[PDB]
Each structure stands twice: as structure tokens, then as C-alpha cells.
Amino acid sequence: RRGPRLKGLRLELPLDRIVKFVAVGSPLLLMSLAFAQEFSSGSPISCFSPSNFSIRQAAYVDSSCWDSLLHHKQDGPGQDKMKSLWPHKALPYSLLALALLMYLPVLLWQYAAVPALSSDLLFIISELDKSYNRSIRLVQHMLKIRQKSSDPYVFWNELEKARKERYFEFPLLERYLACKQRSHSLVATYLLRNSLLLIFTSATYLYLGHFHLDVFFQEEFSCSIKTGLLSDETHVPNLITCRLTSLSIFQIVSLSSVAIYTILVPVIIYNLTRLCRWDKRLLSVYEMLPAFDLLSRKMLGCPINDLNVILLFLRANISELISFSWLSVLCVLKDTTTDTVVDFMTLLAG
Amino acid sequence: RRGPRLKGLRLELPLDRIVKFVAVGSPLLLMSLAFAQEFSSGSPISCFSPSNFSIRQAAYVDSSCWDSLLHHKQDGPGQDKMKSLWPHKALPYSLLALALLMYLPVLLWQYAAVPALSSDLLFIISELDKSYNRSIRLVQHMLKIRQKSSDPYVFWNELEKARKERYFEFPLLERYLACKQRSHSLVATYLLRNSLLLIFTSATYLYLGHFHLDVFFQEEFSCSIKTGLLSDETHVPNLITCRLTSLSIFQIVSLSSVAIYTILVPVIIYNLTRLCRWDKRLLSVYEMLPAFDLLSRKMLGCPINDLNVILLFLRANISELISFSWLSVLCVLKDTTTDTVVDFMTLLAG
Amino acid sequence: RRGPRLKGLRLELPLDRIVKFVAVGSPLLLMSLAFAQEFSSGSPISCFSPSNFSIRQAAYVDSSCWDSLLHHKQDGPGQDKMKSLWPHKALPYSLLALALLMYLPVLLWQYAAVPALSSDLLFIISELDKSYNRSIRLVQHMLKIRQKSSDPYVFWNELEKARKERYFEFPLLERYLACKQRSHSLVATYLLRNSLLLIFTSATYLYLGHFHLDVFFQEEFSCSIKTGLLSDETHVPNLITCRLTSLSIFQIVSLSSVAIYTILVPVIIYNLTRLCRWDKRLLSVYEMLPAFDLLSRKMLGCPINDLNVILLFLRANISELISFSWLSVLCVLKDTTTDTVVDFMTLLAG
Amino acid sequence: RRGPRLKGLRLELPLDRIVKFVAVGSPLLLMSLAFAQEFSSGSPISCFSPSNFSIRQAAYVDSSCWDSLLHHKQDGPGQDKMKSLWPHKALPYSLLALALLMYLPVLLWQYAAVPALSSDLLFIISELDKSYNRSIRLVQHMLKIRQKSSDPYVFWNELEKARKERYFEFPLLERYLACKQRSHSLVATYLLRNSLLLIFTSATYLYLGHFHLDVFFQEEFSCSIKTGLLSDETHVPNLITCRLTSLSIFQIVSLSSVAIYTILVPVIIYNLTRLCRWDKRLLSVYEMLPAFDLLSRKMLGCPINDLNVILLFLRANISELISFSWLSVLCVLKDTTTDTVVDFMTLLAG
Amino acid sequence: RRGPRLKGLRLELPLDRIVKFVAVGSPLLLMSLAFAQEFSSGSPISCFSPSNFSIRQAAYVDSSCWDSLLHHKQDGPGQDKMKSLWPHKALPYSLLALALLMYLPVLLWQYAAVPALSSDLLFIISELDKSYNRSIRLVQHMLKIRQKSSDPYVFWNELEKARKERYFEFPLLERYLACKQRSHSLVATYLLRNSLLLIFTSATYLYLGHFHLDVFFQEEFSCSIKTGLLSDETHVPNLITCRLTSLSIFQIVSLSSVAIYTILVPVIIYNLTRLCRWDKRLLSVYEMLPAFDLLSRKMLGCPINDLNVILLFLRANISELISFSWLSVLCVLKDTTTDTVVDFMTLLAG
Ligand SMILES: *[C@@H]1O[C@H](CO)[C@@H](O)[C@H](O)[C@H]1NC(C)=O
Ligand SMILES: *[C@@H]1O[C@H](CO)[C@@H](O)[C@H](O)[C@H]1NC(C)=O
Ligand SMILES: *[C@@H]1O[C@H](CO)[C@@H](O)[C@H](O)[C@H]1NC(C)=O
Ligand SMILES: *[C@@H]1O[C@H](CO)[C@@H](O)[C@H](O)[C@H]1NC(C)=O
Ligand SMILES: *[C@@H]1O[C@H](CO)[C@@H](O)[C@H](O)[C@H]1NC(C)=O
């Protein structure tokens, strides 16, 4: 039971997982599409060499014109003195670099803040189950006292006496939460990961705005082979002019990437917005029980604190651990009640 | 038992599963077929370049004419001044977009209403099994009383006394159902998912009615290569005219998609119609037992409530859980009867 | 034991499984053969273009002549004014449609009548095992009585007394069978599934009789490329005449399909014959025991009843469940007898 | 123990398994080889079209000549007026037909006589184990009586008394074997399966004699393309003459198949011969024990009986069940003896 | 223990396993190499057709020349009137035939002598473990008697008395071995398998000496196409001379096979030599104990006997069962000794 519980612990939340998967998969899918087009078209570009050229010489012209992009500019018949068509060649490598950059912050977060968070969460839940059991065991005596005397004054007096009994309130948890309220490692790592994601998205936006808008259409370009040593070769023409077939793919890729990452600009910000606010209905739900009461009163300071991330993960986990399926119903009863405690006690006893 | 039971819980119903599978498989299958044709034919289009052209120049003409679709229009010999053949090129990408769009609402429904529904169903079934056991334990005493006295007046009096015994009726369940009858999260998500499916089907209809009927046949088209820089090349012709071989595939795809999605317009509406009416024979069957009595008195309210979705899922689950195979036979006995309780008690004890 | 028994339940009969597999597999195998032929020869048809045409022009002629089948009808040199060669192109798609059509009724039967039949069968067998145990427990006392008194008059009197003991006859099963004898859901679904299979087979027969006999041989056909814009091109011929290589495959496919489905016309009819008649030797075998006697007295009604399908599946299952291996031997003894009960009791006790 | 034993039961005599595997594997292997040859050489035949023909025209001639085999005859320069070369084309399809035909009887035997044989075998072995135990438990008393009195007269008298004790001889098995000795279902199915195998082998012999000997060598053949519409084309020759490269493969295939099936004519006959003779050393071995004594007295009847097949599978199974390993050694002792029962009892007790 | 032990029994010896694997793997490896060569070069032979011939005519010449090997002879410029080059074509088929031939005796041995040997070994080991336990139980009393009286005369007398105690010597084993010493089934099958291996090796030697030495080099050969109908074609040459590229592979294959099988001529003979001599140090080691003594006194008979094969397998198995882990050490002690029994008893008790 305990062993399986530790393994099932969610240490990356349910929503950030989809963001990570999208941000790491989209560039890989686009790069795979680029390679698929490269191997489907056979030749990345096609050139209109004169009829005299044999097949091997035409292939030489094709290869030399396609390989001379990263080194020298090539100008089309609508452009200024120079235009750079290098992004057509380095597209898949840039996509791989983007994928690695987007994956980096995930590795940073995991390696830097998985162990401390795991230890804190497991300790807290282990203490909290026992705390809940100890808190509930007193409800029987509370019910007996309430049955004996109906007036609410004695009920309140006995509630205060039980709170002062000192059989609970777990000073271990008190001091641990007090220490956590100062720590900043978890919030630092979370904010840093989100900021890295935002910075890399902005880097992609800049890359696609500077080096893709200029040559977005760039149908054809006038290549040259005489720049080398065969400058005295009269057989070859001077300015063989040719085009690149995969252009459409390139276009789509660029646009596609932009769109996807725009969808990820709000969501990520929302993830960063979660910390600035304490997690309210559930707060009122858990205020009643002493076991959760101790951690409920630790929300007077600035919302940015190491205990805030622990609270987020604790809620995301207790939604399934099992220790939440009851108090919610009890507080639903309390909301419905104009007796609620008696009904809850009967249900718990059953 | 409890662990395996929660795993087997059906959280997506049996009928909607087929619709979800179809709406995603169909576009993916059509896209795979399109790619298979593209790699089987080798060239998406074929062009009738003059004899003088070498193989490389003919390949250049083919590539330039096929790549100049998304950018410029191409006119056939039966058309108006202009006609755009771009849908021939962006077909697989549009299929990707449609597949993602149809998969989106499934993800929305899952991530937004799987956990609340799962918890509610688990709690309800856990309470209901014990409720049924407690209800049946009293049938023995009822049988003893009936054996002692045969008149029906004492039967009615003892039934009323048992109903007033307060050993059951589970006020927990009463308050939970009362609270649920106000919730709207589950119905909101269900209606939103169905409406998203309908909206995306209408979007596909509009897309295939606007951008496919015009170029549905469009056998051939007259391409041009002189639009670029090689406008002084007398060697090349002016208006090389050529055709696209995969046309038939395209045609079929369009038609096929339409048909399939039409089949999904009624079914989805039926899914939306399930909520407008409370689930009648089964209601009368379960009215008898006190355990199901509490949840069978909620039919008065408006059909659109969070308890309605829970009722649908509860019926779909109880059809196989085990807690239904008995009461159905007991109410069949009641219908057949002009002793039934004694026979049912004997069967349950066995 | 109980859990494994439920899974092992045969809910589709042994014979109908082979019919389903054949009907859903034959078209898929033929379609795979068609695609294999399409990709083995490289091209579906071959055309005899003049010598002047380059390779690219010949490929254009081939593609345009093969793609102009669905859109226009071509004419061979043995035919009337015009003939339709479109079935050569839409063959694999028609095979896909046929496979889906034949698979549809299986899905209908499953989704519509798997749960009710499963519940009824499991309940009936669960009752019947303990019913047989209770019935056999009395054979010891019966044997003691027979040993004490040898005359058959007392034997018959004690048999009647035991039948009237009211310790068995399970009124639950009496009423359940009385109810099932009116239901018609299972028979309706079974008849509908078989009728759908027959209707789809007849549809295939009509399709192959209308759209394949006309162009069954159709060796060659005269294609034309001037129909488009290039009507002023004197270089091209007028009526390029060419042939389709895969014809033989097509032929075989058609014939093959016909044959297979003919084999399925009797068998399916035989499946519909099983309902019109009740399942006789086994009936007399099971008449003796009280446990099976109750369901053995329902043969008077009409053969078409919901209890008939349940009987068929019950026999098909009890052939392996274990509850049949004994009574058959006991009735074999009874047939051989000119003591049998004592021998059967000894065997059962062992 | 019991469960695993049922699964391990053999319902296909070891020897027949190899025949079943061979008769369905050889044609499949040959067909795979034929397809491998078809795809290794690229084209099934090669034709010697004149030099003027372009590559596409030569491919058209090849396809039309290879496709015109099933439709029209083709004559070589050594033949009569006509010769039919269609077996070259329909070879793999005929191999598929042969494989299906050979597999059909296996399916018939399974579906028609697996369940009855399985039930009979399992019942018989289940009874026989306890029967052997009961027979053995009396050997101790027999040994004590023999020790008390050494004369053989008292030994024979006590043996007769034990045989008459009525504590065994299992009248259940007496009646069951009496009923089985008249049944003919198992022998009918076995003989029918063997006869089907023989008939299909004879069909293959006839097919390979009528349609493969005539064109066994048939090196070349004179094809023609003018039969169609292009009878006014002076460019094409009249009687293009060409050959088929895979001939050798074809030859081998034919021969190979013949050889294999000849090997299967004796073996199958042997399988049919086993029924005509009752299973002799083992019969004398098992005659001694009372448990096997009852089933050893049925040899008088005609060899063809359902009990004969049950005996065959019973021996094939008891060779490994475990019940055979003892009595064989005991009868070996009896053969060696000029005390044996005492030694056997000691071994069994150990 | 008993179940796992029977599975672990080795019924094929360790040394013969390597021979069986090699004799079936080598030809398969060579055949795979031959097919790999056939598909690596594209064509099996190359022919020097004149320049006038087009590509298709050259392919026709290649195919016709390579296909006329099995039918007609072809002579090079160093040979007699005729030389046969058919072994170049039937090489992989001959390799398959050889692989099947070498695998046949393995199947024969398995199907004919796996069950009898398995049963004999199982019974022997099962009785032998108990025999050893019974034999060792008396060593304690032997030690007590030796301690009481030190003289060896009483030790010998008590050893004889124990041998005559009749509490062991297992007459079952005596009679089983006596019966086995006459049986010849196992020796017959073993010798037949070895002789089949030798005969097939000799057949391969003859095949490679007759049909490979003649045409071992046979660089080129003169092919003719005019033998057919096209004898009036002046366009074609008369005696096209051409070569076969894979020759080297062929050569190697032949040589390789020879070498491997020579390595298998001694080893197999050694396997046949094992039976002519009874298995000596181990015999003297096991002669001491009464359990092994009974089977150690059968060495007098002829070496060829069914008990000899059982002895070989029994030693090969007892080398790993566990029952040998002590007696070997005990006889090592006896060899070392100028007390040994006491030390052995202490070790066995521990
Ligand atoms: C064609 O080839 C000749 C020599 O091979 C060369 O002089 C001429 O420049 C070539 N044509 C063009 C357009 O360069
Ligand atoms: C054929 O080639 C010549 C020169 O190479 C060119 O002038 C002519 O335009 C070409 N034919 C066509 C139809 O363009
Ligand atoms: C052959 O080519 C010439 C010109 O290229 C053309 O006029 C003629 O029609 C062609 N042959 C045929 C049969 O069309
Ligand atoms: C060669 O071609 C010419 C015309 O292209 C044709 O008349 C002649 O028949 C051809 N040769 C043969 C052997 O058919
Ligand atoms: C070359 O071709 C001519 C006719 O096309 C033919 O007569 C001659 O034999 C050929 N040369 C050779 C070496 O076959």
C-alpha cells in the first residue's frame, strides 16, 4: 500500500505535462516532416541547366547550387542587391536545437527539485493520514457529549477543551511548515522553468521574424558555378538560375510553429499565475478539521513561498490519494445544513 | 475487489466510444491513403513538356508547376478568368487539422470531467452496495411477520413502520443528491463536447462545400514557368499545359468524408437527446427498494442537471457491476404476480 | 472458478464464427492481392504511344488515359458505341465497402444483444448447478426407499411425493422462462443479422452481375488526350489505343468472390433453420431430471421465441461447462437398461 | 493436476500431425518460392521486340503477351496447331486452392469430432485412475492370503472370489463400452478425412498430368499484338516471338510437388490401416488387471467401431499420462518369471 | 522437484547436439549466401551482346542463355564436345535437399526412440534415488558394528550379512536390466541414425566429386538463341559467348561444404564407437554401493545392447542430477586411503 502510493505520486502536475509534451513533440514532428519531404522529392532543389549538359553535369550543377547557400547569398528577380537563403538549409538543425532547448528546462526542474518535493510530499501525507485518524477518533466522544447536553455553549466549551487537549496539533508539522514558509528553492525552480519556456518561445518568435519573413516566398534564385576554378570553361553558362521545390513545406512549417507556440504563451502564464494566489472553497472545507487546520492558517504572508508549491502538489495528489473523498462530503453537509455532524458521524461509523 | 472494480468503471459510455473512434480514424485513414497514392505515383502531377526538354528540365517543369499552386492560380480550358487549385496540395494538412480538431473535445471532456465523475460514481456505488445489503436484511423479518399475519393491512402498517425505522434512508445520500441537483458542471461539459463535435462537422461541411466543389473535376490546368526571371528564354514554351494524376483519389476522399460525417450528425444528436429525458421501466423497477428509492424521487426536477449524467453513467455501470441482475428478476416476478418476496429472499440468500 | 467460467462463455456459437471470419477476410485478402498487383507491375495500364514521344510524354499519356476512366467511358474495338471501364479503378474501394458492410451486422449483434444474453446465460447456469446438486441430494433417500420396497407402485408414489415435496422446482426459473417465452429481442436481432448477411450477399451478386459481366474481358480500349485543351497540338496523335495489364487479376477476383459467397448462402440459411425447430435426443435425455424438466416443458409454444436462442446458447455452452458430462451417461444407461440410479449416484459421489 | 492433464490430452495421433503439417506447408513453400521468382527477375517473361521499339513500347509488348495466356493459346516451333500455356499464369492460385483443399479435411475432423472424443477420453481416464487404485488396494489382501496358504488352488479360488466380490467391474463402463461398440461417428469422420486426403492427392496428380506434361518444356512461344484494334499499324511486327524466363522454376515446382505427395500415399494408407486391426502384446499385458480387463474383452467385434478410435487415442495418451509406466513393468516381470505381485505391490507403495 | 527433473532430462547427449546443429546449419548458411549473391549482382550471368542490341534485347539474351542450362549443354573454349553447366543453376535446391536429408535422421531418432528412452530413464532414476537412500541408511549400523569390533573379519562377515539381509537389491531392477540386456530397439535406432549420417555425407562427397569437378572453373561458355523459332533472324548473332559472374561463390561453397563434412566423418564414427565399449574408473567407483552394484554386474554381455545406450544416457544425466555429487568423493577417499565410511556418512548427513 505505502510502496505503491509513493510510485503513483504526481510530481509534474496534470496540466504542465501536456505543455511539455506539445513543446517537445511539435518541433520533432516538423523536423520529421522536413526529412520526409527531403527523401520524397529526391532532390531538395531543381535547376534548369541547358540541354547540352549530360545527366552527371546537371547533377553537379544541382548539388553545387544547393550546397552554396550557407556560404554565399543568392538573389532572385525581385530582390535587392543581396538576399540570404540559408534558412532553407539549416531548418531541420534549427528544429533540433529548438527541441533540445525546450526540453532543457524540464530536465533542470526534474534534476533540481524532484527529490526535495518528493520527500516533503511523502512525509506530509504519511503524517496527515495518522493526524486525520487521531482527529476522527475523538468525534465519538464529542457526539456522546453533544447527546448528553443539547445546548451549544457546552458544545463550544468542549470543542475548545479538545483543541487544547494537546493530544494532537502535531508540533512537528507546525515547525516544518514554519520552516517551509521561508524556503524559496521550489518557487525559484518553478518560476525559472516557466521563464525559460517563455524566453525560448520569444527566441523562436525572433528567429522566425528575422530569418524567415525576408525569404518567406523567394520562389527562385540565380545560382552560379563559375565562382570556383572553372571560370575559363566556356561550355558552362554564367548564371544558371533555378528553384527550390520544398518551399511550400518550409512556409507551412514556419507558420505552423508560430501558431502552436502562441497557444502556449497564455497557458504557461497561467501556470505562473497559480503561485501568486493561495489555493477558496477547499480552504473553507479543510479549515474545520484540526489535521488540515494547522496548514490552513499559514497563508498570511506573501503568496510566493515554498509552501505554496507544496500546497499545489498536495491538492493535486489528495484529489486521488483517498484522504479527500470524505471531508468534501462532510462540508457539503455543513453547507446544506440550516445535525450535519451527527449525519457525518453516522456515515463514518457505518 | 474494490481495486479491480474502480479500474473497470466505464467513464465514457459504450456508444460514444464508437463515435469518438470513427471521427478520428476516418480522417487519419484518408490521409494515409492520400500519402500512399502520393508515394505510389511518384509525381503528384504530370506535365507534357516538349520533346526538346531533357529529363532534368522536364522534372524542373513538373516541380515548378506543382509547387506554384498555393501561391498562384491556374486556369483550365473551361473556367472563368481564374481558378485556384490549392486544395489539391493542402489536403493532407487539412486532414491533420480535422483530426486534431475532432480529438480536441475528447481531451477537453477527459481532463475536465473525468475525476469528479469518477469520484462521484465510486462513492455512490460504495454506498449503494451496503444500502442494498441493509435493505435486504430486513426482508427476513418482513417474511416472518407476513407468515404470522396474512391480511394486507398489517403488511402496509409494517412497511410504513420499517420505512420510518430510521435504520436506513442514508441522509448522506439525500444531501449528496440534493447538492448534485444544483450542479451543472457535468451537463455543461457534456453539452459543450457534443456542440463542439457538431460545430466541427459543420466546419468540415463548409470547407468541402466551398473549396472542393469548384475544383471537383478540374481535369487539367495551364501552368507557366516564365513568370520568374527566365522570361527571355526562347527555348522554353510559354504556357506548358498539364494535369494532376491523383484527381480521382481527391474526389473520392472528399465524398467519403462527407458521407461518414453525415452518419455522425444523427447519432451525436441522439447523445445530446439522452439528457433531456430522465432514464421508465427501470425506474419503476428500482422504485420498490428503499436503497434506490431515494434517487428515484428526483425525477421531478428539470432533466438538465448534474444528477442526470450521473444517472446515465450509473445505469451503464450497474448493467455489469452485479448489483442489478437481482432486482430486475424480482420486479419481473412482481409484474408476473397477479410469496414473491419470499422467493426473492431465498434466491438472494443462495 | 466462477470468474473464469464467465469469461469462457461462448456468446457467438462455433459455426457462425467461421462464417464471420470468411465473410470479413475474403474481401480483405482479395483487396490485398489487388494492391500487390498494382505495385508489382509498377503501372496499372500500358499504352502504345508513338516513337517520337519521350519518356515523360509517354508517362503523361499513361497517367491521363488511366485517370480518365471514372470520369469518362472508353470504347473497345468489339463493343457498342460506348462501354464503361470504371469498375477496373474502383475495385479496391468497393472491396473495402463490402468488407465494412459484412462487418456491420456483427457489430450490430454484439452491441445490441451481448449483454442481455450474457446475463441470462450466467444467471441460468448459476441457478442450474445448485439445482442439479439439490436434485441429486435426494437420490440417496430415493435409493434407500427402493431398497426397502421392491415393487414399482411404491417407487412411483414416492417419485410423485418427491416431485410434490416443494423443496425444488425453483419458481424463480418458472417465472423467468414464462417471461422469456414472450420476449422477442434476441430472435429479432439474430434474424436481422442473418437477413443483413443475405441482403449484402445479394447486393454483391447484383454488383458483380451488372458492372463486371459487361466488361469482363475488355482486353484493350482506345483512349484520347485531345479532349482537354491541347486540341491544337498536331504533335500528339488523336486516339492513342492501349490496354490494362492487371485484367487477369480482376477477372479472378470477381469469380473468386462469387464462389466464396455462394458457399455462404446455404450455411447462413441453415443458421436461420435452427430457430424454427427446437433442440430431440438431448431433450428426452434432460426430461428426466427435475432441474432441466422445467425448461423441457416449454417446447409447446412457437419455435420463434427468445427462450429458443437462450436454449441454443445453453446447449452450446453446457457441452463444455461440465454439467452435461454425467446426465448423458445416465440416459445412455437408461437406454441400455431393459439399479441405474444407484450406479449414477455412485459415479456422482465418486 | 487435473486441469493440466486435460490440456495435454492428444486429439491428433502423433504421426498424423506430420502429414497434416507437410500437406499444408509444401504448397505454401512452393507458392512463396514462385512469388519470390516473380519478383526477383522483375518480369515473368521476356520478348524480343525489334530495335525500333522504344522502352515503353517494348514494355507494352511484354505486358500484352504475358497477359494474353489465359485468354488465347500460343504456339511454339515444335507443337501442333495449338498449345495452351495458361498453367504458367495460374500456378500460384492453383497452389492456394490446393493448400485450402488439403487444410479443409483437418477443419472438418476438428469441428466434427474433437468434442465427443475429448469428453470420452477425459471421462475414461478419470474413471480409470480410481479404478486402478481400487484394483491395487486388494493386492495386499491377496498377498496375505497367498502367504497364509501356498497351494495354487486356494489362490485361484480367492482370485475368482475377488473377481466376484462386485466391488469393481464398474457397470458404468460396461454399458458405456457396449454403447460405443455400435457408434460409428468417430470411425466415419476418420475414414472420411483419410479418403478426402487421398482424393485430393489424386486430384493433384490428375491436374499435374493433364495440364503440366503437355507444356512441361515449351521453351518459347510466338505471341501477337495485332489481334486487337491496332491491325493497321505497319510499324509493329505481326508475330513477335518471345519466351518465359521462370520456366525452370515451374518445372521444378511440378516435379517437387509430385514427389512429396507420393511420399504421403503410403503413410496415409497406413493411418487408414490402423483401424482394421485391433490394438497384441499390450492387450495381453493389460488383460490381467480387472480395471483394463473389461475393455480388453471387446476385441471379438468388427475392427471398425467407435471404440477402436477411442482405443487408439487412449493408448496414444496413456503412453504419457503416467498410468502406463507400472503395468508394463509388472507384465515384464510376469514374462520373466518361470512373488511378482508382492514386488509390484512394494514398487507401487513406494 | 520430480516434475522439473523430468523436463531437465537430456535425451540427445551434449556432443551429438553440436553435430546435429552443424550438419543442418552449414548447408542453410551456404544457401543463404547463394541467394544473397544472386540478389546482390542483380543478374546471375552477364552476356556480351553486340552494340546494335537494345536494352530489352540484351535482357532477353541474358535470360535465355541463363535459362538454357538445365535443358541444354554449353561449351567453353577449353572443353570437349560437350560440357554440362547445370550444377550452377540447381545449387540452392540441392542445398535444400541436403539440409532436409541431414535433418531426416534426427526426426527419425526422436519420433522412434524418445519415449521409450525417456520412460526407462525416468523409472531408473526414480527407483535409484530411493535405492541410494535405503543403502545409506544402513551405514550408521555398519559404523556402530565397526566401532564395537575392530577386527576386519567381523566387518566382512557383517557386510555379507547386510548384502544377504534382503532389505534391498530391488528385484524390480534385476528383472528390468535382464529384459533390457536383450532388447535392441535403442541400439538399432542409434546405429541407424549414425549410418544414415555417414551415408548422406558419402552422398554429398559423390555429388561434389561428379558434378562439380568437371565444371569447377568453367569461366565462360558459348550460348545460342537461334535454336528456337527465330532461326531466320539475321539481325541476331549465332553463338553469343558469355560468362557467369557468381562463379567464385560457387567454387567456395563446394570447397567449404567438403571441408565441414570431413570434420564430421571422425566425430560421427566416435559416436558409433561409444557403444562398442562399456562405460572404467566410474564403473569401479559405483561398483561399491549396492544400488549401482546391480547394474554394474551386467558388463559381461556383448557391448551392443539396449542397456548400453541407457547406461550412456544415465551417466550423461547423473553427471548433473545431484546423485553423483557424493559417491565420486567417497571413492576418491577410498583411493587416497592406504574411517572413510564414517567421514562419508558424516558428509551425507550434513
Ligand atoms: C552548348 O554547347 C556548346 C559546346 O558543347 C557551347 O559552346 C555552348 O555555349 C552551349 N550552349 C550554351 C547555351 O551555353
Ligand atoms: C525546340 O528547341 C528549339 C531550340 O532548342 C527551340 O527554339 C524551340 O522553341 C523548341 N520547341 C518548342 C516547341 O519550344
Ligand atoms: C512524329 O513527330 C512529328 C513531329 O515531331 C509529328 O508531326 C508526327 O505526328 C509524329 N508521329 C505521329 C504518329 O503522330
Ligand atoms: C522499323 O521501323 C519502321 C518505321 O519506324 C517500320 O516500317 C519497320 O517495320 C520497323 N521494323 C520492323 C522489323 O518492324
Ligand atoms: C548489326 O545490325 C545489323 C542490322 O541491324 C546486323 O545485320 C548485324 O548482324 C549486327 N551486328 C552484329 C555483330 O550482330
From Swiss-Prot, chains A, B, C, D, E:
Domain of life: Eukaryota
PROSITE patterns named in the record: PANNEXIN
Topology in the lipid bilayer: Multi-pass membrane protein
Gene this chain is encoded by: PANX3
UniProt keyword list: Cell junction, Cell membrane, Endoplasmic reticulum, Gap junction, Glycoprotein, Ion channel, Ion transport, Membrane, Transmembrane, Transmembrane helix, Transport
Name of the protein in question: Pannexin-3
Topology Cytoplasmic: residue spans: 116-196, 270-350
Transmembrane region(s): 21-41, 95-115, 197-217, 249-269
Extracellular side: 42-94, 218-248
Entry keyword annotation includes Transport: yes
Record note on quaternary structure: Homoheptameric.
GO cellular component terms, semicolon-separated: endoplasmic reticulum membrane; gap junction; plasma membrane
Cross-referenced PANTHER family: PANNEXIN, PANNEXIN-3
Protein family according to the UniProt entry: Belongs to the pannexin family.
UniProt GO BP: cell-cell signaling; monoatomic cation transport; osteoblast differentiation; positive regulation of interleukin-1 production
Primary role: Regulator of osteoblast differentiation by functionning as a Ca(2+) channel in the endoplasmic reticulum which regulates calmodulin (CaM) pathways. Allows ATP release into the extracellular space and activation or purinergic receptors.
